[PDB]
Amino acid sequence: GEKISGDDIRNQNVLATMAVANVVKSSLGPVGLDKMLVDDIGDFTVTNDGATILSLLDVQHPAGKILVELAQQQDREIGDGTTSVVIIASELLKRANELVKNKIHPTTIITGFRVALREAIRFINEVLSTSVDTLGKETLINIAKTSMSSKIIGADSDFFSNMVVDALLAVKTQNSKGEIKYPVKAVNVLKAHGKSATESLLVPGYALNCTVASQAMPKRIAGGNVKIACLDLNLQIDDPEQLEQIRKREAGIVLERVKKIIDAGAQVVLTTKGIDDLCLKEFVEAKIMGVRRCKKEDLRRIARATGATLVSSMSNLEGEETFESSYLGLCDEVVQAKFSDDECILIKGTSKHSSSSIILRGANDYSLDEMERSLHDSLSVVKRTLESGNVVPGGGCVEAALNIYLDNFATTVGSREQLAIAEFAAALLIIPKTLAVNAAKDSSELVAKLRSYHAASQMAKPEDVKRRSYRNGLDLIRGKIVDEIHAGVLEPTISKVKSLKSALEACVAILRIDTMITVDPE
Amino acid sequence: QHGLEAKKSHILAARSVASIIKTSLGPRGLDKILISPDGEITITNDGATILSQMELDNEIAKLLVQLSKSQDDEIGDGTTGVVVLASALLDQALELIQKGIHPIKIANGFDEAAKLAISKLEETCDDISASNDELFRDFLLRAAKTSLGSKIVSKDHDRFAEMAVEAVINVMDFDLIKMQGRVGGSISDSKLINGVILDKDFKCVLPKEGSDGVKLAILTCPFEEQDKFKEMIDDVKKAGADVVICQWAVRWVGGQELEHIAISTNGRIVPRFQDLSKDKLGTCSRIYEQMLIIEQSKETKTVTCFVRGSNKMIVDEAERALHDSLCVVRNLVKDSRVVYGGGAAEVTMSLAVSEEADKQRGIDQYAFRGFAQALDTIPMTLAENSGLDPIGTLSTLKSKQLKEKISNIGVDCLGYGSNDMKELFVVDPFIGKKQQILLATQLCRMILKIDNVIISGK
Amino acid sequence: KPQEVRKANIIAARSVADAIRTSLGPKGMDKMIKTSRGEIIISNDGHTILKQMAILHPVARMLVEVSAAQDSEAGDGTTSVVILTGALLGAAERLLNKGIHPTIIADSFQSAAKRSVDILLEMCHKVSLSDREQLVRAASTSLSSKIVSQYSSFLAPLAVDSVLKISDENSKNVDLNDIRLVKKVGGTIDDTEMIDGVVLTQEKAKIGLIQFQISPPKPDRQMDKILKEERAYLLNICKKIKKAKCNVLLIQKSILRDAVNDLALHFLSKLNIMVVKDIEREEIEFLSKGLGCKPIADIELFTEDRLGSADLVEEIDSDGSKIVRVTGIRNNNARPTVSVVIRGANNMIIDETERSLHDALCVIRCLVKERGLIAGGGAPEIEISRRLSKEARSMEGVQAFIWQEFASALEVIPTTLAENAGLNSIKVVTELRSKHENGELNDGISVRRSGTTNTYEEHILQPVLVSTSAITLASECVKSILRIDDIAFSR
Amino acid sequence: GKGQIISNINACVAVQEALKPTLGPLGSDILIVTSNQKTTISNDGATILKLLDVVHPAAKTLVDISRAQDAEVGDGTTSVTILAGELMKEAKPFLEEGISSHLIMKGYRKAVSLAVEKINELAVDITSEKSSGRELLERCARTAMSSKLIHNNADFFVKMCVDAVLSLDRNDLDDKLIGIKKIPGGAMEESLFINGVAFKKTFSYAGFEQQPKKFNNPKILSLNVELELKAEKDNAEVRVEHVEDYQAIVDAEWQLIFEKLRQVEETGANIVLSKLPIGDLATQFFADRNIFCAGRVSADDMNRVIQAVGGSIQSTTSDIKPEHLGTCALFEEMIGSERYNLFQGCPQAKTCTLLLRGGAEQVIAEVERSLHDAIMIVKRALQNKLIVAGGGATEMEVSKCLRDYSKTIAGKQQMIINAFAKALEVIPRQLCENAGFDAIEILNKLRLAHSKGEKWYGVVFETENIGDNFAKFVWEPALVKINALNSATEATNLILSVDETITNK
């Protein structure tokens, strides 16, 4: 291998970062444009999420790997707003590379942004406040409409204010020594082709993904305390005498293992593999609902909800094979919903933890994929939203509001970190600047208003009232002065706290880079 | 490339040309072979003429063109090491710029330190004009013998110096005197006449009616056919002129050589044939071949020397030394202030700034000490050529000159057993050391301010 | 060509020694290393740098073994050994031109190294065996070779209190091999805390150890014959374990062939018996010392006596990671083991935290190996060079010029810290030479103030063993290079 | 498009990076390499940009800046010229952005328009102190010594530059009126002032030292045709029958020359000045009269002779008038075996002559630039007396008031004006790199200076700290600072007005 020296090796990663930055900047905001990627098998996919793009982005430089780790980290922290988070780390290296050229030391920018961000927590907490001007569930309704950023389905969020918001209201459970939690993945997403996306229906419970084929299954079921039986077992030579010995015993054992579940009082049976028609005959006389061709991962969520424990095969402490009743779950009722000639099992009234499900409808798989991951990413935001009642004003207007706080903070510290604070505040103006590029607007006209109006409250004395501005602020679509508080646009505190703090730490490893060492692969 | 890295790619190249002529300084120098781009071969032990004509790339050596055309014309003595002397102040600054010192702080540091050592030179300054004509003439004999001529003239300079001093006394109250020489003879066989050397030939002229003159005639325009040809010749013999000078019997006389004939004879040039008269005729003793010998009975302002040597290179080295000898003697009689050179004057200015460094202190403390170390490297050049330890010998001489205020004792350029320059009668012009040591700071003003070099295209 | 062939490798050695100068100090910068497998590894120390660097010159290859000895001792500032090596090789080129034999140059470095150790003993500061005041100040200061002390607030008392509780306050050895560094995804750097017992990487339960693999009779009418015979052998194992009351079983590496049958997990699930496999044999030392578990080769020799003992064993789930925590330790041991679980958001932060914490443990081991304290910021390097400069003129001889160059090479270490911070090389050193005569020996230099100021008041302390081992290992490397006068390429 | 302008500005900034060590006395000389092997090392940008090879056609604007710098102002090539293109450096990130430079050109135009009123507001009137031409011009002369190699020895030049311009008529001041004679070799302190017309260089032929240098009251005489025998005479058609007829041509040419020299001899002039050179035919004729004769008079020399004695070129003896014969009070011939004509006692002469002498030819070339720059300072000071601190620190206090007008914009031009004030911070940044000072330490106290002291903040370089150049007696004409922004306005607006270039072949 060889080694490349000089300061040009840092610019090589910056130019490579700016090359992939402008690619994902086109997906920022609802006015942005989606992109198409190809797996080089001939198949393609359409998604605006940067987490999928960076996962499929091939970068031989270590700078591209940091963006992958940053995108995967924001998935568990937030899960949405990738274009409003990961892209921030792009221009962060651009302005930091400008000062370090001559009169600035690499650690000065590291210590410059660290002290600024540490003191910005109190500045963010000033703007940060509890949810106000919201009645009942309107707190999540106003946030559900904010999905226009990083997700292009935000135009349909008017109808999504019901199915999506009410989905996580019924999953409320109490665990971890009296702590209200919202378990992730508890919402099962189903896909269908037909009608329109406005036909989505919310199920207050888990909905199993399957299709009813054999008509021997009962079409109606009633009664409470329905027992769920999950079984992963598959139930369906020189002379013919040896063949008859193994055949007559196999047919007897398969039908006997079915009767072991019948004696346990199981109302519904979930089998991973297929079920023969002769086995379904015992379910009709015993009033049992048979189900075949089930996914193992889909049955794991049932154990965490109703409590039904999966059984690999019949066995016991002794040599006799039977089925214990302790493996059965608890659910209130079973509902069969037929959607486009496809019937799914709806499980409601879970025991351990309550869950829900959402059925999606669309034209093709690409129309469903835009409605699948996007709405699923909005559920992860609601997970962190209801955890901390404090919220921030939406529209990405908090970056321009904190710029006036950094102007007075730059004079407090000063020294060599004053230039880093000025560039850190100038980097915050790039976020609304990119929003004006895709919206075909004038950035200099909007930024001039972001600096003039939002800084009027800091210059004027707050104790004298004379507020005369709200500062709360902007408008992407119309380029006019309106308020989101009346328009219902608000963002949770997770979009900034525990979000940009880890994103601004990406430049710490970049500024300490000296040279590049590449070893020849085997 | 720009910045400090660009300054090192150029200024540091001055150490290369400094070590080239380092071994050629003084009588201990060695002959170096130089080849011009045109194919000419130049072999001499004088480093002043080596760096004068050379083909180099970096412009750091191009500033030496104005230095070579100055010191050689103004003084000529001790000018062999003027580049090493100029680089001595630069080599000390190369260690200062590494410390981050500003060039103006270096320039003002060496400028003020060089002015403080002038007062020390006034204390040891002597006057050769205050003595009689016996001591004044004797000092001119040993001045260029132990210093100026480095080639073969070490022992034999008594012949070249005596002929040079007598040429100075005759014109004493060189630009109007033409001097040249022919390859042949030896050192002690050189001849001196009053007049200008005429290489063109036509025999002996007898005394005329006037005392000690030939009534010489010079006509620029040729006679202009046979009737007027012999008629104009008889007009020349009317005034008793046996020798006639015409461009188209001495014929084919150069333009500059013809004027030197009229200057020595105090005559006039006659362009026509009707302007010939005894008032326009020059005064010359006689013209004969002993190349025609032009003699002047009365004392005139034209006195030339004829260089003779066994080798063709001796004539070029001896004559060039006479051009520099006339410049040194001119400054000795004009400027009464004189100093003792040959290693004593360079060390003298080093101890002056050394004592003044502890008085000023401040930021200039190490700047003044660097100026002392820069002057200490000058005798180190002659120490290696003479076999003496540069560090060991100077450490002993600085200790002897500490107790005894006389600085004349120092490194001997000749290498003899006498370290006292006053005993060897080594005298250098005070203005000479001023145009060498002090004026070198002016050359450093252009070098220290070098920052970025702009290289254009073709 | 004895001199020219050796000098050709010195230039390549000084080039690597000059490149690693940017990796020293808090103002330094690290390098990016791309492994042949495709994984990116970035570290400030020269351990990974020299490990992945392949140079045909044998001098550059011998620097790996020399640095590896210092990496296991200190771990921070280990590049100064190579920097001092490259400085002595560059200074030996001028000493060799004076007519001095290379072995005499090599022997003069060892003679000056013996005096350097005595200076560190005279400048040795008194330090108590067990204290939380002195050990914390010395721990976070040596970590300045990387970026640590920002988040070390919770990390500094951890390494101090853990090592003292592992063995004792009597110093002597106190090896670090008993420390289990556990890396898990999630959490932050400040969330890293010590655990009172051993934790598992992969209520009142007993933890056993199994060296074999539980499985039917398959060492590494037919339908009913297979089911009955396999379940019979697995049931006999369950009866022996149930009588021993062992709720936690540990299995060796299963990835080869047999692994573990699913039928054996069904019988052990009713008895609430834990099954853990794919465990490296190196973890037995932690299981035998900490949990008192005796390796069990065969089920025939399985009994309760070979089983371990514990008070409370429970499973702790931190950020989705399943970790088995053991509360209390009951066994016969003179050196109880303490495990530390490292938490971090990204793998690059977790990998950097390991080397940052491991180097923080090594400096504590250097304090219990040899007690002492020295000044920071390369200040002791000047006082050692100051004495050798005066002793060179006293002894005179041919070593006077060699000890002067050996003392000048010691000034490169404090000069490197100034060059990486944006300070002039000679201008700062020139000002320090007047300050070293001022501060009077042990008074050190601070990086933030960029000048000479107090050490203990500024929380700057360094162990004496690191400076002693650095000079010793650097001297052995320089004497070996000049002693080899030529190289050869063969089988 | 906008991408081509970025490459055009980077080519202009590339040479400006080397021209940074110019403004201020602490600047460093810049080295150039030409094709003629003859280069001039100086801080002057007019000489460097003239000899620098131009690649892109827009780079020729920098050459026109130096040409307009001397025509509109006359000095500041080491200060104003390098700052004419600094607005394009701060406008470089604006080109990548969608911001149209049309509003940027209006942003800088409105910024420099309000700055002129600020320059006149801070201008101090010295007429209240009754400062004469001594104290006023001496403090301005030391300010002109910035960017010049001579510093410690510049005290001798202050006395020479002030006394030379005061002898010249203060109603009409021009560089072409006063003469400058550069003599290589010698020393700098040997420079003297001449009260009259001086010859171009010198003429040395035949007898040279034989001419006495001490005269009483010579008289100036003007001639036209060249004098010589059968060499430079005008060719004509002459019928030659025999070889002996050539003697008649010699007599016909001599009598034609003799009658013209005998008729003019009645004037009795001791100095003979001809438009062409003088040969030996007139030399021996003038030797009997014991009069001085010098030929090869340049056209610039004759124009200054008319201002004193009032003579005229005489091609014939019939037009000779007594009014064309002047005189002088004293005449002395001045170096390196070269005679220099020096006239004295010419009160009617409207022109002056200064004799410059120096060892280095490159250093004296900048001294000529120092003379041209000092006259423009004296010319604009005597017309209007105003006090402005030099060293580029004048825009420091002005930048604070410029930010006040930006807050009243509330438009796209608000951030444009802030970029103009940010461009003013480049001046102290380039000065810190020249003296090695920390740029951050100066900029921190620069923003804190206008909050307390205000007035004049000069950043004194002698104390290595912050200070005021007003108390240091550093004065600069305000007309140079006012027109400094006008030169940068037309320069910045010209490059931003070209979105593409066209090159044929």
Instruction: Enumerate the β-bridge partners of residue C324.
Output: C200, C315
- Among C415, C423, C427, which would you mutate to test the B interface (most chain B Cβ atoms within 10 Å of its Cβ)? C427
**Which domains are seen in chain A, by residue range?**
1-131+390-522 (1.10.560.10), 132-203+354-389 (3.30.260.10), 204-353 (no CATH)
CA distance A422 to D361: 49
Whole-number Cα distances in Å, B297 to B211, B216, B217, D357: 9, 14, 18, 42
Answer whether A513 sits within 8 Å of C345, measured CB to CB: no
- Provide DSSP, D19-64: T-S-SSTT----EEE-SSS-----S-HHHHHHHSPP-SGGGHHHHH
**B400 DSSP 8-state letter:** H
Q: Which residues contact D244 (CB under 8 A, 6 or more apart)?
A: B228
CA angle A194, A197, A198 (to 5 degrees): 115
Q: Find the CATH number of the domain harbouring D378.
A: 3.50.7.10
Q: Does residue D146 sit in the same domain as residue D253?
A: no
Using a CB–CB cutoff of 8 Å, tell me whether B5 touches chain D: no
What does the DSSP assignment read for B134-151? HHHHHHHHHHTTTTT--S
**Residues 223 to 252 of C: which have CB under 8 A from any B CB?**
none
Measured distance CA(D387)–CA(D375) in Å, rounded = 17
* C-beta separation of A146 from A80 below 8 A: no
Give the residue numbers of A marked as catalytic.
49, 82-83, 377
Residue among D13, D19, D29, D464 with most chain B CBs within 10 A, to mutate: D29
Neighbours of A128 (CB within 10 A): 18
Three-state secondary structure call for residue A418: helix
Instruction: Give the side-chain half-sphere CA count within 13 A for C321.
Output: 19
Q: Do D241 and D256 lie in a common domain?
A: yes
* Chain B contact partners (≥3 CB pairs within 8 A): C, D
Q: Which chains does A contact via 3+ CB–CB distances below 8 A?
A: C, D
| Contacts for C115-118: CB closer than 8 Å, 24+ residues apart | C115/C387, C115/C388, C115/C391, C116/C384, C116/C388, C116/C471, C117/C468, C117/C471, C117/C472
- Other CB atoms within 10 Å distance of the CB of residue C89: 23
Give the rounded distance of the alpha carbon of B305 from its chain centre. Answer: 16
CATH class of C1-127+372-491: mainly alpha
- Give the CATH number of the domain where residue B183 resides: 3.30.260.10
Is residue D233 domain-shared with residue D142, that is, in the same domain? no
D274 and D136 share one domain: no
Shortest CA gap C439–chain B (Å): 22
Q: In what order do the strands lie in the sheet with D271-274?
A: D220-223, D271-274, D292-294
Best mutation target among D89, D444, D451 (most A Cβ atoms within 10 Å) is: D444
Residue C270 buriedness (CB in 10 A; 0-12 / 13-18 / 19+): middle
User: Do D389 and D406 meet the contact criterion of CB atoms below 8 Å apart?
Assistant: no
Q: Does an H or E element contain B306, and which? A: strand B303-307
Question: Do the Cβ atoms of A187 and A168 come closer than 8 Å?
Answer: yes
Task: Establish if D13 touches chain A: CB-CB under 8 angstroms.
Answer: no
Neighbours of A458 (CB within 10 A): 15
Chains A, D: CB contacts within 8 A come to 34
Say yes or no: B44 and B97 in one domain. Answer: yes
| D138 in the same domain as D286 | no
Q: Which amino acid is at A49?
A: D
Residue A416 touches partner D, C-beta closer than 8 Å: yes
Q: What is the 3-state secondary structure (H, E, C) of chain C?
A: CHHHHHHHHHHHHHHHHHHHHHHCCCCCCEEEEECCCCCEEEECCHHHHHHHCCCCCHHHHHHHHHHHHHHCCCCCCCHHHHHHHHHHHHHHHHHHCCCCCHHHHHHHHHHHHHHHHHHHHHCCCCCCCCCCCHHHHHHHHHHHHCCCCCCHHHHHHHHHHHHHHHCCCCCCCCCCCCCEEEEEEECCCCCCEEECCCEECCCCCCECCCCCCCCCCCCCCHHHHHHHHHHHHHHHHHHHHHHHCCCEEEEECCCCCCCCCHHHHHHHHHCCCEEEEEECHHHHHHHHHHCCCCCCCCHHHCCCCCCCCCCEEEEEEECCEEEEEEECCCCCCCCCCCEEEEEECCHHHHHHHHHHHHHHHHHHHHHHHCCCCECCCCHHHHHHHHHHHHHHHHHCCCHHHHHHHHHHHHCHHHHHHHHHCCCCHHHHHHHHHHHHHHHCCCCCEECCCCEECCCCCCCCCECHHHHHHHHHHHHHHHHHHHHCCCCCCCC
B310 and B184 housed in the same domain: yes
Residue C223 has its nearest CB partner, among A249, A317, A509, at A249
Q: Is residue D380 packed enough to be buried (19+ CB in 10 Å), middle (13-18) or exposed (0-12)?
A: buried
**What are the Cα distances from residue B397, in Å, to B428, C88, D15?**
21, 35, 52
Residue A394 tokens, joined: 């939406």
Pairing verdict, β B32-35 and B41-44: antiparallel
**Which string of DSSP letters, residue by residue, matches B140-187?**
HHHHTTTTT--SSHHHHHHHHHHHHHHHHHHH---TT---EE-SBS-S
Give CA D18 to chain center in angstroms.
22
E-strand stretches of A132-276:
173-175, 179-181, 187-193, 201-203, 205-208, 228-231, 268-271
> Looking at the 3D structure of chain B, how many domains does it have?
3
> Which three-class secondary structure state does DSSP give residue B77?
coil
Neighboring chains of C (3 or more beta-carbon pairs < 8 A): A, B
Nearest to B411 by CA among B423, B430, B429, B393: B393
> In terms of domains, do B290 and B319 share one?
no
Q: Using the beta-carbon criterion (under 8 Å), do B100 and C424 form an inter-chain contact?
A: yes
Residue appearing with tokens 């100075």: B168
Backbone CA torsion sign across B399, B400, B406, B409: negative
Quickly count: other Cβ atoms within 10 Å of residue D384's Cβ. 12
Contact at 8 Å (CB) between D230 and D249? yes
For A148-172, give the DSSP string. Answer: GTT-GGGGGHHHHHHHTTTTTTS--
The reply to whether residue D444 touches residue A415, judged by beta carbons under 8 angstroms, is yes
Technique behind the model: cryo-EM
Q: How many residues does chain C have?
A: 491
CB contact under 8 A, A414 and D444: yes
Domain C197-335 coded CATH 3.50.7.10: yes
Give C-chain residues touching A313 at CB under 8 angstroms.
266
Chain B residues within an 8 Å CB radius of D39: 59
Residues B307 and B190 in one domain: yes
Residue type for position B238 = K
Breaks (C-N over 2.5 A) in chain B follow: 173, 202, 224, 248, 290
Domain termination residue (choose one: B318, B336, B354): B336
* Alpha carbon distance, N-terminus to C-terminus of chain A: 12
**Pairing assessment for the beta strands C445-446 and C451-452 based on DSSP bridges:** antiparallel
Residues B137 and B156 in one domain: yes
- Give the CATH number for residue B100: 1.10.560.10
Angle between helix C399-410 and C79-96 (nearest 10): 150
Instruction: Give the CATH number of the domain where residue B236 resides.
Output: 3.50.7.10
Residues 6 or more apart whose CB falls under 8 angstroms from that of A67 comprise A20, A54, A57, A59, A86, A89
Residues D211 and D321 in one domain: yes
- Residue ranges per structural domain of chain C: 1-127+372-491, 128-196+336-371, 197-335
- Pairing, β D179-184 against β D331-332: unpaired
**3-state DSSP call for residue B122?**
helix
Tell me the resolution in Å.
6.8
Q: Provide CB contacts within 8 A for B123, sequence distance 6+.
A: none
- Within 10 Å of residue B81's Cβ, how many Cβ atoms? 24
Angle between helices A88-99 and A8-24 (to 10 degrees): 150
Using the Cβ of B98 and the Cβ atoms of chain C, whether some distance falls under 8 Å is answered with: yes
Instruction: Give the C-alpha separation, C95 to C75, whole Å.
Output: 32
Q: Can chain C be said to touch chain B, i.e. do they have 3 or more Cβ pairs within 8 angstroms?
A: yes
Residue B314, C-beta contacts closer than 8 angstroms, at least 6 positions apart: B151, B152, B187, B307
Residue D229 sits in the same domain as residue D312: yes
- Spatial CA neighbour of A274 closest among A291, A296, A253, A287: A291
Instruction: Give the span between the Cα atoms of D221 and D219, in whole angstroms.
Output: 7
Domain that holds residue B157: 129-194+301-336
Structure tokens that stand for D67 in this block: 């040409």
Q: Which residues pair with C316 in a beta bridge?
A: C323
CA-to-CA distance for C285 and D90, rounded, in angstroms?
A: 66
Residues B372 and B441 in one domain: yes
Tokens of B131: 């003595």
Q: Are residues D217 and D159 in the same domain?
A: no
* Exposure on the CB side of residue C22, measured as CA atoms within 13 A: 21
Nearest neighbour of A73 by CB, restricted to C52, C345, C421 = C345
Question: Per the CB < 8 Å rule, is D412 touching A448?
Answer: yes
Residues of B numbered 44-63 whose beta carbons fall under 8 angstroms of chain D's beta carbons: which are they? Answer: 59
How many other CB atoms are found less than 10 A from the CB of residue B190? 17
CA separation for the pair A170, A204 (Å, rounded): 7
CA–CA distance, B245 with B265 (Å, rounded to integer): 13
Closest to D390 in 3D by CA, of D71, D69, D79 = D79
Q: What ranges make up the beta strands (E) of D308-457?
A: 331-332, 353-358
Q: Residue A414 and residue D98: Cβ atoms within 8 Å?
A: no
Which chain B residue lies closest to D26 (C-alpha atoms)? Answer: B104
Contacts 24+ apart (CB under 8 A), B91-96: B91/B15, B91/B18, B91/B374, B91/B377, B92/B370, B92/B371, B92/B373, B92/B374, B93/B370, B93/B444, B93/B448, B94/B11, B94/B12, B95/B370, B96/B367, B96/B370
Give yes or no for a contact between C474 and C480, defined as CB atoms under 8 angstroms apart: no
Q: How far apart are CA B434 and CA A381, in angstroms?
A: 86
**Whether residue C45 lies in the annotated active site:** yes
Type of residue numbered C249:
L
Contact at CB, D440 and A451, closer than 8 angstroms? no
Question: In chain A, after which residues does the backbone break, taking C–N over 2.5 angstroms as a break?
Answer: 236, 472
**Cβ-contact A228, A347 below 8 angstroms:** yes
C430 vs B contacts (CB less than 8 Å)? 99
B23, B27, B32, B37 alpha-carbon torsion, rounded to 10°: 110
Please, what sign has the CA dihedral across residues B71, B75, B76, B79? negative
- Cβ-Cβ contacts under 8 Å between B and C: the total is 9
Q: Are A407 and A425 in contact (CB under 8 A)?
A: yes
The Cα C424–Cα C2 span in angstroms is 37
Residues D232 and D335 placed together within one structural domain of the fold: yes
D265: domain range? Answer: 198-382
Q: Is A183 helix (H, G, I), strand (E, B) or coil?
A: coil
CA–CA gap between residue C462 and residue C441 (Å, rounded): 15
Q: What DSSP state is assigned to residue A472? A: -
Q: Which two tokens stand for residue C355?
A: 């080397």
